[PDB]
């Protein structure tokens with residue numbers, strides 16, 4: 001919720017359909033209240049298409065959101081201690097090709113559901129390319 005926050009992404013690449021990839025992201029320097037929590041996840045954008053939310057996790061209570069397109073293939077997990085989130089993407093399809101952006105929102109109560117709208121996220125990573133060939 002800090003100002004010199006940096007989201008650091010890792011992973012990505014290109015694979016043939018059916019294979020798997022993993023993304024990772026670290027929210028460095030984000031300071032926040034013991035009475036609050038916040039959400040982290042990935043949006044993706046394909047060329048000429050609107051960005052869309054992929055999967056998100058609320059820190060602390062591990063609540064998750066997955067877009068219907070990825071349920072059963074994608075898994076988002078959080079490492080409390082290493083301050084990272086990661087996204088395991090199995091059975092990848094051509095429709096999954098995109099730039100995937102890590103994101104985090106301003107801190108808020110645990111009572112709020114994990115956030116998944118692009119307008120609800122204020123910190124963004126630079127992007128990591130994902131390509132699934134035929």
Ligand SMILES: [Zn+2]
Nearest residue numbers: 038039105115
């Ligand atoms: Zn949130």
